[PDB]
Write a protein that binds this ligand. Sequence first.
Ligand SMILES: [Cl-]
Ligand SMILES: [Cl-]
Ligand SMILES: [Cl-]
Ligand SMILES: [Cl-]
Ligand SMILES: [Cl-]
Ligand SMILES: [Cl-]
Ligand SMILES: [Cl-]
Lengths: 225, 225
Amino acid sequence: ADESFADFFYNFASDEKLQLSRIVFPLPYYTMEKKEHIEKDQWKHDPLFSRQDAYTVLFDKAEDMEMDTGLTSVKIEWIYLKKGKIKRYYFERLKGLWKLEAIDFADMPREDTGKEDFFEFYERFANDSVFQLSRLHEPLKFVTADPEDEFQILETTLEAGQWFAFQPVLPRENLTNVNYGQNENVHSNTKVIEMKGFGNGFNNTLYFERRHGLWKLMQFEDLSD
Amino acid sequence: ADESFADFFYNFASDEKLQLSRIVFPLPYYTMEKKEHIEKDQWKHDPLFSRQDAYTVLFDKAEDMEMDTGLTSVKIEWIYLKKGKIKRYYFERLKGLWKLEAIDFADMPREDTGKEDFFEFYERFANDSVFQLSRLHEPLKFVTADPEDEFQILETTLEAGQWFAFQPVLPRENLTNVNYGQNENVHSNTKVIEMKGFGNGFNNTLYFERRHGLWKLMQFEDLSD
Ligand SMILES: [Cl-]
Ligand SMILES: [Cl-]
Ligand SMILES: [Cl-]
Ligand SMILES: [Cl-]
Ligand SMILES: [Cl-]
Ligand SMILES: [Cl-]
Ligand SMILES: [Cl-]
Protein backbone atom coordinates (compact mmCIF):
# COMPACT_ATOMS: atom_id res chain seq x y z
CA ALA A 1 0.00 0.00 0.00
CA ASP A 2 2.95 2.46 0.67
CA GLU A 3 3.81 4.51 -2.44
CA SER A 4 6.96 3.73 -4.35
CA PHE A 5 8.94 6.97 -4.86
CA ALA A 6 9.74 6.23 -8.56
CA ASP A 7 6.04 5.63 -9.42
CA PHE A 8 4.91 8.73 -7.44
CA PHE A 9 7.67 10.82 -9.06
CA TYR A 10 6.58 10.01 -12.61
CA ASN A 11 2.93 10.80 -11.73
CA PHE A 12 3.80 14.03 -9.85
CA ALA A 13 5.88 15.32 -12.81
CA SER A 14 3.29 14.37 -15.46
CA ASP A 15 -0.10 15.21 -13.85
CA GLU A 16 -0.78 18.89 -12.95
CA LYS A 17 -3.79 18.29 -10.64
CA LEU A 18 -1.90 15.49 -8.81
CA GLN A 19 1.17 17.75 -8.38
CA LEU A 20 -0.93 20.61 -6.90
CA SER A 21 -2.62 18.13 -4.46
CA ARG A 22 0.71 16.70 -3.19
CA ILE A 23 2.42 19.98 -2.18
CA VAL A 24 2.06 21.73 1.22
CA PHE A 25 0.47 25.20 0.61
CA PRO A 26 1.63 27.86 1.57
CA LEU A 27 4.91 26.14 0.63
CA PRO A 28 7.97 27.00 2.80
CA TYR A 29 10.64 28.33 0.38
CA TYR A 30 14.06 28.82 2.03
CA THR A 31 16.08 31.24 -0.03
CA MET A 32 18.80 33.88 0.51
CA GLU A 33 18.96 33.34 4.33
CA LYS A 34 15.22 34.04 4.61
CA LYS A 35 12.00 32.08 4.35
CA GLU A 36 9.32 32.74 1.74
CA HIS A 37 6.07 30.95 0.99
CA ILE A 38 4.69 29.92 -2.42
CA GLU A 39 0.90 30.31 -2.48
CA LYS A 40 -1.20 27.59 -4.23
CA ASP A 41 -2.48 30.31 -6.68
CA GLN A 42 1.19 31.11 -7.62
CA TRP A 43 2.35 27.50 -8.25
CA LYS A 44 3.66 26.77 -11.81
CA HIS A 45 3.67 23.07 -12.84
CA ASP A 46 7.17 21.71 -12.33
CA PRO A 47 7.98 18.85 -14.79
CA LEU A 48 11.23 18.38 -12.72
CA PHE A 49 13.46 16.23 -14.97
CA SER A 50 10.72 14.34 -16.91
CA ARG A 51 11.61 16.23 -20.16
CA GLN A 52 15.32 15.14 -19.88
CA ASP A 53 16.73 12.06 -21.63
CA ALA A 54 18.90 11.29 -18.57
CA TYR A 55 19.49 12.35 -14.96
CA THR A 56 22.29 12.07 -12.42
CA VAL A 57 22.60 10.66 -8.93
CA LEU A 58 25.59 11.78 -6.82
CA PHE A 59 27.70 9.93 -4.22
CA ASP A 60 30.66 11.06 -2.03
CA LYS A 61 32.22 7.60 -2.40
CA ALA A 62 31.76 4.48 -4.58
CA GLU A 63 30.91 2.34 -1.46
CA ASP A 64 27.90 4.69 -0.69
CA MET A 65 26.22 3.19 -3.88
CA GLU A 66 25.59 -0.26 -2.28
CA MET A 67 22.16 -0.04 -0.51
CA ASP A 68 15.33 -0.14 2.80
CA THR A 69 11.78 0.46 1.22
CA GLY A 70 10.91 1.76 4.76
CA LEU A 71 12.60 4.98 3.52
CA THR A 72 10.25 7.96 3.88
CA SER A 73 12.52 10.91 2.93
CA VAL A 74 13.80 11.82 -0.50
CA LYS A 75 15.57 15.05 -1.54
CA ILE A 76 15.52 15.86 -5.23
CA GLU A 77 18.16 18.41 -6.27
CA TRP A 78 18.89 20.66 -9.27
CA ILE A 79 22.52 21.89 -9.46
CA TYR A 80 22.76 25.18 -11.44
CA LEU A 81 26.46 24.98 -12.37
CA LYS A 82 26.81 28.43 -14.08
CA LYS A 83 24.61 30.38 -11.54
CA GLY A 84 26.33 28.60 -8.62
CA LYS A 85 22.88 27.64 -7.20
CA ILE A 86 21.10 24.54 -5.86
CA LYS A 87 17.36 23.91 -5.67
CA ARG A 88 16.24 21.17 -3.20
CA TYR A 89 12.80 19.54 -3.00
CA TYR A 90 11.97 17.83 0.34
CA PHE A 91 9.71 14.85 -0.39
CA GLU A 92 8.29 13.02 2.61
CA ARG A 93 6.21 9.81 2.70
CA LEU A 94 3.24 10.52 5.03
CA LYS A 95 0.68 7.82 5.74
CA GLY A 96 2.22 6.02 2.71
CA LEU A 97 1.76 9.10 0.42
CA TRP A 98 4.62 11.25 -0.92
CA LYS A 99 4.25 15.01 -0.29
CA LEU A 100 6.37 18.09 -1.13
CA GLU A 101 7.10 19.67 2.26
CA ALA A 102 9.55 22.47 1.46
CA ILE A 103 11.97 23.87 -1.12
CA ASP A 104 15.49 25.33 -0.73
CA PHE A 105 17.00 27.67 -3.38
CA ALA A 106 20.44 28.61 -2.12
CA ASP A 107 24.06 29.35 -3.02
CA MET A 108 25.90 26.19 -3.99
CA PRO A 109 27.50 25.00 -0.69
CA ARG A 110 31.18 25.73 -1.41
CA GLU A 111 34.16 23.71 -0.16
CA ASP A 112 36.04 25.96 2.32
CA THR A 113 39.54 25.67 3.96
CA GLY A 114 41.12 26.57 0.55
CA LYS A 115 40.36 23.42 -1.51
CA GLU A 116 39.15 22.91 -5.13
CA ASP A 117 35.40 22.70 -5.13
CA PHE A 118 33.99 19.67 -7.04
CA PHE A 119 31.11 21.56 -8.82
CA GLU A 120 33.38 24.47 -9.88
CA PHE A 121 35.80 21.80 -11.21
CA TYR A 122 33.00 19.79 -12.93
CA GLU A 123 31.61 22.95 -14.64
CA ARG A 124 34.99 23.69 -16.23
CA PHE A 125 35.66 19.92 -16.91
CA ALA A 126 32.39 19.67 -18.95
CA ASN A 127 32.69 23.14 -20.66
CA ASP A 128 36.44 23.36 -21.41
CA SER A 129 37.74 20.36 -23.37
CA VAL A 130 41.39 21.58 -22.90
CA PHE A 131 40.93 21.70 -19.11
CA GLN A 132 39.04 18.35 -19.37
CA LEU A 133 42.04 16.67 -21.12
CA SER A 134 44.47 18.06 -18.39
CA ARG A 135 42.28 16.54 -15.60
CA LEU A 136 42.16 12.90 -16.82
CA HIS A 137 44.10 10.65 -14.45
CA GLU A 138 46.94 8.65 -16.01
CA PRO A 139 45.95 5.87 -16.41
CA LEU A 140 42.20 6.42 -17.05
CA LYS A 141 40.26 3.24 -16.14
CA PHE A 142 37.35 2.01 -18.29
CA VAL A 143 34.93 -0.69 -17.09
CA THR A 144 32.12 -2.13 -19.21
CA ALA A 145 29.61 -4.97 -18.85
CA ASP A 146 31.01 -8.17 -20.37
CA PRO A 147 28.70 -9.07 -23.38
CA GLU A 148 28.92 -12.75 -22.29
CA ASP A 149 28.41 -14.27 -18.74
CA GLU A 150 26.25 -12.67 -15.99
CA PHE A 151 27.57 -9.94 -13.58
CA GLN A 152 30.99 -9.93 -15.39
CA ILE A 153 33.03 -6.83 -16.34
CA LEU A 154 35.72 -5.93 -18.87
CA GLU A 155 38.48 -3.60 -17.64
CA THR A 156 40.95 -1.56 -19.75
CA THR A 157 42.59 1.90 -19.77
CA LEU A 158 41.59 4.72 -22.13
CA GLU A 159 43.70 6.98 -24.33
CA ALA A 160 42.52 10.64 -24.36
CA GLY A 161 40.99 10.15 -27.85
CA GLN A 162 39.00 7.10 -26.70
CA TRP A 163 37.67 8.94 -23.61
CA PHE A 164 36.29 11.77 -25.83
CA ALA A 165 34.84 9.27 -28.36
CA PHE A 166 33.06 6.98 -25.84
CA GLN A 167 32.16 9.48 -23.07
CA PRO A 168 28.45 10.20 -22.43
CA VAL A 169 27.18 13.69 -23.42
CA LEU A 170 28.40 15.48 -20.31
CA PRO A 171 25.81 17.85 -18.70
CA ARG A 172 27.21 21.42 -19.08
CA GLU A 173 24.73 23.67 -17.21
CA ASN A 174 22.94 21.44 -14.71
CA LEU A 175 23.36 18.29 -12.69
CA THR A 176 20.66 16.54 -10.67
CA ASN A 177 20.65 14.46 -7.51
CA VAL A 178 18.30 12.04 -5.78
CA ASN A 179 19.33 11.94 -2.20
CA TYR A 180 17.80 8.88 -0.49
CA GLY A 181 20.18 8.97 2.54
CA GLN A 182 23.77 8.80 1.08
CA ASN A 183 26.35 11.31 2.54
CA GLU A 184 26.37 14.70 0.76
CA ASN A 185 29.41 16.47 2.20
CA VAL A 186 31.06 19.52 0.68
CA HIS A 187 34.48 18.25 2.12
CA SER A 188 34.70 14.80 0.38
CA ASN A 189 37.91 14.31 -1.68
CA THR A 190 36.04 11.71 -3.82
CA LYS A 191 32.87 12.13 -5.92
CA VAL A 192 30.77 9.91 -8.16
CA ILE A 193 28.35 10.98 -10.96
CA GLU A 194 25.94 8.16 -11.87
CA MET A 195 24.09 8.96 -15.14
CA LYS A 196 20.79 7.12 -15.67
CA GLY A 197 18.22 7.15 -18.46
CA PHE A 198 14.42 6.82 -18.59
CA GLY A 199 13.37 3.30 -19.71
CA ASN A 200 16.34 2.89 -22.13
CA GLY A 201 18.65 1.01 -19.68
CA PHE A 202 21.43 3.65 -20.07
CA ASN A 203 23.86 3.75 -17.18
CA ASN A 204 27.26 5.55 -17.20
CA THR A 205 29.23 6.23 -14.02
CA LEU A 206 32.09 8.73 -13.53
CA TYR A 207 34.53 8.45 -10.60
CA PHE A 208 36.48 11.54 -9.49
CA GLU A 209 39.18 12.14 -6.86
CA ARG A 210 41.00 15.26 -5.63
CA ARG A 211 44.69 14.21 -6.11
CA HIS A 212 47.44 16.59 -4.82
CA GLY A 213 44.76 19.38 -4.68
CA LEU A 214 43.20 18.77 -8.13
CA TRP A 215 40.11 16.83 -9.04
CA LYS A 216 40.77 14.18 -11.70
CA LEU A 217 38.61 11.74 -13.61
CA MET A 218 39.75 8.34 -12.20
CA GLN A 219 37.34 5.90 -13.95
CA PHE A 220 34.51 5.66 -16.47
CA GLU A 221 32.16 2.75 -16.17
CA ASP A 222 29.53 1.96 -18.86
CA LEU A 223 26.95 -0.50 -17.43
CA SER A 224 24.32 0.36 -20.13
CA ASP A 225 21.78 -2.45 -20.84
CA ALA B 1 26.17 55.76 -50.33
CA ASP B 2 25.51 52.02 -51.22
CA GLU B 3 24.68 49.95 -48.11
CA SER B 4 27.24 47.55 -46.77
CA PHE B 5 25.60 44.12 -46.29
CA ALA B 6 27.19 43.53 -42.82
CA ASP B 7 25.92 46.90 -41.48
CA PHE B 8 22.43 46.38 -43.00
CA PHE B 9 22.32 42.80 -41.64
CA TYR B 10 22.97 43.86 -38.05
CA ASN B 11 20.29 46.60 -38.30
CA PHE B 12 17.74 44.32 -40.03
CA ALA B 13 18.16 41.63 -37.31
CA SER B 14 18.02 44.10 -34.39
CA ASP B 15 15.33 46.66 -35.41
CA GLU B 16 11.74 45.35 -35.88
CA LYS B 17 10.35 48.41 -37.77
CA LEU B 18 13.41 48.44 -40.08
CA GLN B 19 13.02 44.69 -40.77
CA LEU B 20 9.30 45.07 -41.68
CA SER B 21 10.17 48.01 -44.04
CA ARG B 22 12.90 46.07 -45.91
CA ILE B 23 10.86 42.97 -46.89
CA VAL B 24 8.69 42.63 -50.04
CA PHE B 25 5.03 42.08 -48.92
CA PRO B 26 3.24 39.77 -49.81
CA LEU B 27 6.52 37.84 -49.52
CA PRO B 28 7.05 34.98 -52.03
CA TYR B 29 7.66 31.82 -49.94
CA TYR B 30 8.76 28.81 -52.02
CA THR B 31 8.06 25.66 -50.10
CA MET B 32 7.14 22.00 -50.82
CA GLU B 33 7.11 22.47 -54.65
CA LYS B 34 4.56 25.28 -54.31
CA LYS B 35 4.60 29.02 -53.73
CA GLU B 36 3.05 30.72 -50.72
CA HIS B 37 3.01 34.35 -49.64
CA ILE B 38 3.67 35.77 -46.16
CA GLU B 39 1.40 38.76 -45.51
CA LYS B 40 2.88 41.83 -43.69
CA ASP B 41 0.29 41.27 -40.86
CA GLN B 42 1.63 37.66 -40.42
CA TRP B 43 5.38 38.54 -40.27
CA LYS B 44 7.20 37.53 -37.02
CA HIS B 45 10.47 39.39 -36.31
CA ASP B 46 13.35 37.20 -37.44
CA PRO B 47 16.54 37.82 -35.37
CA LEU B 48 18.30 35.50 -37.94
CA PHE B 49 21.60 34.57 -36.23
CA SER B 50 22.08 37.72 -34.06
CA ARG B 51 21.42 35.70 -30.84
CA GLN B 52 24.21 33.17 -31.76
CA ASP B 53 27.80 33.46 -30.50
CA ALA B 54 29.11 32.28 -33.90
CA TYR B 55 27.98 31.52 -37.46
CA THR B 56 29.28 29.52 -40.40
CA VAL B 57 30.11 30.29 -44.00
CA LEU B 58 30.39 27.35 -46.43
CA PHE B 59 32.65 26.76 -49.46
CA ASP B 60 32.89 23.84 -51.96
CA LYS B 61 36.68 24.33 -52.11
CA ALA B 62 39.40 26.18 -50.15
CA GLU B 63 40.30 28.29 -53.28
CA ASP B 64 36.66 29.65 -53.40
CA MET B 65 37.54 31.60 -50.13
CA GLU B 66 39.89 34.09 -51.90
CA MET B 67 37.68 37.01 -53.12
CA ASP B 68 33.75 43.12 -55.38
CA THR B 69 31.66 45.66 -53.24
CA GLY B 70 29.59 46.01 -56.49
CA LEU B 71 27.92 42.78 -55.25
CA THR B 72 24.14 43.21 -55.01
CA SER B 73 22.96 39.66 -54.17
CA VAL B 74 23.36 37.81 -50.91
CA LYS B 75 21.69 34.52 -49.87
CA ILE B 76 21.53 33.82 -46.16
CA GLU B 77 20.89 30.16 -45.32
CA TRP B 78 19.81 28.11 -42.28
CA ILE B 79 20.66 24.37 -42.53
CA TYR B 80 18.30 22.26 -40.35
CA LEU B 81 20.52 19.17 -39.99
CA LYS B 82 18.03 16.91 -38.07
CA LYS B 83 14.88 17.95 -40.09
CA GLY B 84 16.83 17.68 -43.38
CA LYS B 85 15.66 21.22 -44.34
CA ILE B 86 17.16 24.48 -45.65
CA LYS B 87 15.74 27.98 -45.33
CA ARG B 88 17.12 30.58 -47.84
CA TYR B 89 16.69 34.36 -47.65
CA TYR B 90 17.22 36.24 -50.96
CA PHE B 91 18.68 39.67 -50.16
CA GLU B 92 19.04 42.09 -53.05
CA ARG B 93 20.68 45.55 -53.09
CA LEU B 94 18.20 47.88 -54.89
CA LYS B 95 19.06 51.52 -55.44
CA GLY B 96 21.82 50.92 -52.82
CA LEU B 97 19.32 49.49 -50.25
CA TRP B 98 19.17 45.83 -49.17
CA LYS B 99 15.72 44.20 -49.43
CA LEU B 100 14.34 40.72 -48.66
CA GLU B 101 12.87 39.55 -51.98
CA ALA B 102 11.88 35.93 -51.32
CA ILE B 103 12.33 32.93 -49.02
CA ASP B 104 12.85 29.22 -49.81
CA PHE B 105 12.04 26.48 -47.23
CA ALA B 106 12.83 23.19 -48.91
CA ASP B 107 14.19 19.66 -48.49
CA MET B 108 17.96 19.70 -48.07
CA PRO B 109 19.30 19.25 -51.66
CA ARG B 110 20.68 15.70 -51.43
CA GLU B 111 23.74 14.35 -53.28
CA ASP B 112 22.43 11.78 -55.82
CA THR B 113 24.24 9.12 -57.98
CA GLY B 114 24.79 7.02 -54.77
CA LYS B 115 27.37 9.16 -52.89
CA GLU B 116 27.72 10.15 -49.19
CA ASP B 117 25.96 13.42 -48.65
CA PHE B 118 28.07 16.06 -46.81
CA PHE B 119 25.27 17.35 -44.47
CA GLU B 120 24.13 13.80 -43.52
CA PHE B 121 27.83 13.06 -42.79
CA TYR B 122 28.35 16.35 -40.84
CA GLU B 123 25.22 15.71 -38.69
CA ARG B 124 26.56 12.33 -37.57
CA PHE B 125 30.19 13.70 -37.31
CA ALA B 126 29.03 16.43 -34.84
CA ASN B 127 26.50 14.19 -32.91
CA ASP B 128 28.35 10.85 -32.70
CA SER B 129 31.85 11.17 -31.22
CA VAL B 130 32.63 7.49 -32.11
CA PHE B 131 31.73 8.12 -35.77
CA GLN B 132 33.62 11.47 -35.51
CA LEU B 133 36.84 9.68 -34.37
CA SER B 134 36.51 7.12 -37.31
CA ARG B 135 36.26 10.01 -39.86
CA LEU B 136 39.45 11.93 -38.94
CA HIS B 137 42.00 11.68 -41.75
CA GLU B 138 45.38 10.21 -40.80
CA PRO B 139 47.28 12.49 -40.49
CA LEU B 140 44.99 15.31 -39.25
CA LYS B 141 46.54 18.70 -40.13
CA PHE B 142 46.40 21.63 -37.68
CA VAL B 143 47.25 25.20 -38.72
CA THR B 144 47.34 28.17 -36.34
CA ALA B 145 48.39 31.81 -36.56
CA ASP B 146 52.04 32.20 -35.53
CA PRO B 147 52.06 34.37 -32.30
CA GLU B 148 55.12 36.23 -33.71
CA ASP B 149 55.61 37.75 -37.26
CA GLU B 150 52.74 38.96 -39.51
CA PHE B 151 50.76 36.61 -41.86
CA GLN B 152 52.78 33.56 -40.59
CA ILE B 153 51.35 30.12 -39.69
CA LEU B 154 52.35 27.16 -37.52
CA GLU B 155 51.62 23.69 -38.95
CA THR B 156 51.48 20.36 -37.07
CA THR B 157 49.40 17.14 -37.01
CA LEU B 158 46.86 16.29 -34.30
CA GLU B 159 46.36 13.14 -32.26
CA ALA B 160 42.66 12.20 -31.75
CA GLY B 161 42.81 13.46 -28.13
CA GLN B 162 44.20 16.85 -29.22
CA TRP B 163 41.49 17.26 -31.91
CA PHE B 164 38.72 16.74 -29.28
CA ALA B 165 40.47 19.08 -26.78
CA PHE B 166 41.11 22.00 -29.19
CA GLN B 167 38.12 21.67 -31.58
CA PRO B 168 35.51 24.48 -31.60
CA VAL B 169 32.06 23.62 -30.15
CA LEU B 170 30.71 21.90 -33.24
CA PRO B 171 27.13 22.97 -34.25
CA ARG B 172 24.91 19.87 -33.79
CA GLU B 173 21.44 20.93 -35.08
CA ASN B 174 22.04 23.82 -37.46
CA LEU B 175 24.62 25.31 -39.77
CA THR B 176 24.41 28.67 -41.51
CA ASN B 177 25.69 30.04 -44.80
CA VAL B 178 26.27 33.45 -46.35
CA ASN B 179 26.36 32.93 -50.04
CA TYR B 180 27.90 35.99 -51.75
CA GLY B 181 28.59 34.17 -55.08
CA GLN B 182 30.80 31.12 -54.19
CA ASN B 183 29.79 27.73 -55.80
CA GLU B 184 27.20 25.77 -53.77
CA ASN B 185 27.06 22.39 -55.50
CA VAL B 186 25.55 19.26 -53.99
CA HIS B 187 28.17 17.15 -56.02
CA SER B 188 31.46 18.65 -54.62
CA ASN B 189 33.83 16.03 -53.11
CA THR B 190 35.38 18.81 -50.95
CA LYS B 191 33.71 21.09 -48.36
CA VAL B 192 34.84 23.85 -46.03
CA ILE B 193 33.10 25.10 -42.83
CA GLU B 194 34.38 28.54 -41.80
CA MET B 195 33.24 29.41 -38.24
CA LYS B 196 33.17 33.13 -37.38
CA GLY B 197 32.24 35.05 -34.25
CA PHE B 198 30.59 38.43 -33.59
CA GLY B 199 33.18 41.09 -32.61
CA ASN B 200 35.42 38.59 -30.71
CA GLY B 201 37.83 37.84 -33.62
CA PHE B 202 37.08 34.07 -33.42
CA ASN B 203 37.83 32.20 -36.63
CA ASN B 204 38.05 28.38 -36.97
CA THR B 205 38.02 26.61 -40.34
CA LEU B 206 37.30 22.91 -41.03
CA TYR B 207 38.37 21.24 -44.31
CA PHE B 208 36.59 18.06 -45.43
CA GLU B 209 37.08 15.67 -48.38
CA ARG B 210 35.21 12.59 -49.60
CA ARG B 211 38.05 9.99 -49.76
CA HIS B 212 37.27 6.51 -51.25
CA GLY B 213 33.52 7.32 -50.76
CA LEU B 214 33.74 8.67 -47.17
CA TRP B 215 33.92 12.22 -45.98
CA LYS B 216 36.90 12.85 -43.67
CA LEU B 217 38.13 15.81 -41.67
CA MET B 218 41.38 16.77 -43.51
CA GLN B 219 42.45 19.94 -41.64
CA PHE B 220 41.58 22.25 -38.75
CA GLU B 221 42.79 25.80 -38.93
CA ASP B 222 42.50 28.22 -35.96
CA LEU B 223 43.04 31.81 -37.19
CA SER B 224 41.36 33.36 -34.07
CA ASP B 225 42.54 36.93 -33.23
CL1 LIG C 1 21.53 15.85 -15.48
CL1 LIG D 1 44.53 9.55 -19.99
CL1 LIG E 1 46.74 13.40 -2.71
CL1 LIG F 1 26.15 27.91 -36.95
CL1 LIG G 1 43.97 11.43 -36.45
CL1 LIG H 1 44.93 10.23 -28.19
CL1 LIG I 1 39.29 8.97 -53.49
